[PDB]
Amino acid sequence: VPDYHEDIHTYLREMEVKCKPKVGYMKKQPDITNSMRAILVDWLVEVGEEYKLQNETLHLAVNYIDRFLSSMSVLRGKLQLVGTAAMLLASKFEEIYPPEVAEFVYITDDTYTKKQVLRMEHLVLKVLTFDLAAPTVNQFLTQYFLHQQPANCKVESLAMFLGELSLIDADPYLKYLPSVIAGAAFHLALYTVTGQSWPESLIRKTGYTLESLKPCLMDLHQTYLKAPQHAQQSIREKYKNSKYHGVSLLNPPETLNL
């Protein structure tokens, strides 16, 4: 379409391997669990809602957290601080008008001081060596959306919703690359709304087929089916809004016909 669409996709595919957190880091974390991580990410979704942040900002913040926790043991009483600094960093990187630091101190219910947030920001930067331009599920989805025939707002919003749901559950989603999760989310959105499938123009673009997407797709399908019963509900609430065409109210398909 432009120049650079192919060059950019290729580059993001290289960088997603380099920016990937360690699959099994939670096992090496003595004091925190997948469940506590789910509570943090869900809270971040709320924060994103309250300050009207981009979805990209959310995806970036979660990437920073998972990479940080891939090498830094953290106590449960400190997880939220890591999360708050990460959302602050994501905001400065991605937002036209990020919220002020005082506002990030505010949304932690005075759990931490301003100086703690600022010192944690510094530490996060050191640990990530200032490498903040990470590929996200979101960045892959917007590229895949250009292959719709024709464009469909419901498909786009639902795919975004499904991609967002994957952020909550480190098991199983930490083992999948963002481009793969995006593939599964887009097929599942397309199939739910229009009955269409992963298009072969995306097979040409990505090299992914429904066969290669199947492991992620089966997980995502189950996540979608089980969504209303999940302990964390901020994403479902968020995606009730007309902003996202209320796609969280659409009914998941019973089978994928594979």
Binding site: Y4, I8, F93, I96, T129, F130
Partner: protein, 295 residues
């Protein structure tokens, strides 16, 4: 890498955070530029500048060697280049810069920019002050303080971008979406400036800037630029100037150079040439790498 190994030589720039010093590595002998950033936490501009610079390794992009990251100070260590293009043009005031050098510089800039665009980075402040030249004939993009990582397709980014003289018409007219084409506009303005040795469109306000562009390229209509009259800051009252003969815009420029300039200054961002496509323009058939004729 740490501050003991470096010996400050002289101040070579004033920034915003914000003092650039020439320094010598005492152990290796390497001459460097030290950009100091004073420490709302780490500024968003430094966060982006550092993260983006770390990804961009290209011979026509300034090299970020190291980041010295302490309690109250952030030091960015860059490769030292002798001069910026703005000062160079001033030193050649009378009697000009040779066409072969201009061609070489433009060819190199387009290389640097295409690399940026290929790695989803918009520069958003291309101007002669921010382009650095060495004694070997190299020129490099510098100052990524306004840069950002863009998405495909783009969404709405910061409006207040690109210093006025080099700012594209889609920004001036308030389009919700701008993209790589804005960096190409700036480069076209710089190309013209290297040839004529004066700024192409030196307005003192947004409206003044638009009118200067219109008097040179013609007032855009739906024919030349579909959608233009629906743009937020478009006014039907705009005076309607005729486009002028390009041989009069930059008289010393020959047919291939005029062709390339017109493609870089196309109104419609869709039709404006990419950095990648411009590398194959006939203007560059005879391109070499002359050394800068000065110091």
């Amino acid at each position: 890498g740490s501050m003991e190994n470096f010996q400050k030589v002289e101040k070579i720039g004033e920034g915003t955070y914000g003092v650039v010093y020439k320094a010598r590595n005492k152990l290796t002998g390497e001459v460097v530029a030290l950009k100091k950033i004073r420490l709302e936490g780490v500024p968003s501009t430094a966060i982006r500048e550092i993260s983006l610079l770390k990804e961009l390794n290209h011979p026509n992009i300034v090299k970020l060697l190291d980041v010295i990251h302490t309690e109250n100070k952030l030091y960015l260590v860059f490769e030292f280049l002798h001069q910026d293009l703005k000062k160079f043009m001033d030193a050649s005031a009378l009697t000009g810069i040779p066409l072969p050098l201009i061609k070489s510089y433009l060819f190199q800039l387009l290389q640097g920019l295409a690399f940026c665009h290929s790695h989803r980075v918009l520069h958003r402040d291309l101007k002669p002050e921010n382009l650095l030249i060495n004694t070997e004939g190299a020129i490099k993009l510098a100052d990524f303080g306004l840069a950002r990582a863009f998405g495909v397709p783009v969404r709405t980014y910061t409006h207040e971008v690109v210093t006025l003289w080099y700012r594209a018409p889609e920004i001036l007219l308030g389009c919700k979406y701008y993209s790589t084409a804005v960096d190409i506009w700036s480069l076209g303005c710089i190309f013209a400036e290297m040839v004529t040795r004066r700024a192409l469109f030196p307005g003192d306000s947004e409206i003044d800037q638009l009118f200067r562009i219109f008097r040179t390229l013609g007032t855009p209509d739906e024919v030349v630029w579909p959608g233009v009259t629906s743009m937020p800051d478009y006014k039907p009252s705009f005076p309607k100037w005729a486009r002028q003969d390009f041989s009069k815009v930059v008289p010393p420029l020959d047919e291939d150079g005029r062709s390339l300039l017109s493609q870089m200054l196309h109104y419609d961002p869709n039709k404006r040439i990419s950095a990648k496509a411009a590398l194959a323009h006939p203007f560059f058939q005879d391109v070499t790498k002359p050394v800068p004729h000065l110091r």
